[PDB]
């Protein structure tokens with residue numbers, strides 16, 4: 001599957017030490033919603049070494065129970081939310097990773113249309129100003145906080161010719177998501193978007209010109225805490241890691 005996408009256009013093998021490469025990765029830190037993130041999430045996102053770092057051939061994003069204030073808004077958790085400094089239309093995205101094991105964590109590998117104009121993102125209004133869900137988004141991987149034995153792939157968009165919000169996708173079983181690397185991938189072209197866990201198709205959505213999936217998207221990597229899909233966080237939560245061996249994008 002996906003062999004047609006064979007020209008490497010972007011990658012990070014994470015073989016260096018220190019901050020995620022600033023030529024490749026942009027941090028979001030400004031909350032988009034009056035001092036909070038969306039989905040009733042409980043974290044702030046920071047660009048500190050507490051919450052992301054590269055060492056030993058892998059990127060780690062680390063969520064921590066920690067009081068933290070940004071511009072008058074205090075939250076009880078910190079994490080990181082990275083965006084690629086690379087926007088693309090169509091391709092094969094491969095991310096090899098180990099997921100957080102702890103309850104309450106909501107990791108994600110996903111995309112937004114580069115016309116999102118999301119607050120504090122890297123692209124602003126360069127491509128347009130299509131507020132989510134009109135910019136489109138593809139989940140390559142999410143896990144909720146209460147079931148670490150399944151993964152989620154899910155699309156969110158509004159049709160170009162309607163305000164009608166669409167949200168659909170699938171799930172698949174996973175074994176040892178936290179202790180064993182798996183490859184989470186997307187194959188995206190003018191015909192279809194296919195999300196895989198290793199070689200299992202999680203979901204395929206037919207593409208068309210009436211979707212926002214024919215213009216550039218950028219990649220996001222994050223751990224949210226709590227909220228819709230994070231759920232209740234144990235009182236004893238300390239910290240947890242989302243470990244990414246590499247990101248590769250082919251066209």
Ligand SMILES: OC[C@H]1O[C@@H](O[C@H]2[C@H](O)[C@@H](O)[C@H](O[C@@H]3[C@@H](O)[C@@H](O)O[C@H](CO)[C@H]3O)O[C@@H]2CO)[C@H](O)[C@@H](O)[C@@H]1O
Pocket residue numbers: 032038039106107108110118131132133137138139142156
């Ligand atoms: O609620 C109104 C605001 O929506 C913002 O877009 C958010 C949206 O609210 C939120 O539900 C969505 O959450 C993502 C899921 O759809 C999915 O793709 O997985 C992501 C990773 O787990 C998850 O964060 O995110 C949208 C983008 O941040 C609008 O941006 C905002 O203008 C509007 O007021």
Ligand SMILES: [Ca+2]
Pocket residue numbers: 013014015057058244245246
């Ligand atoms: Ca690596």
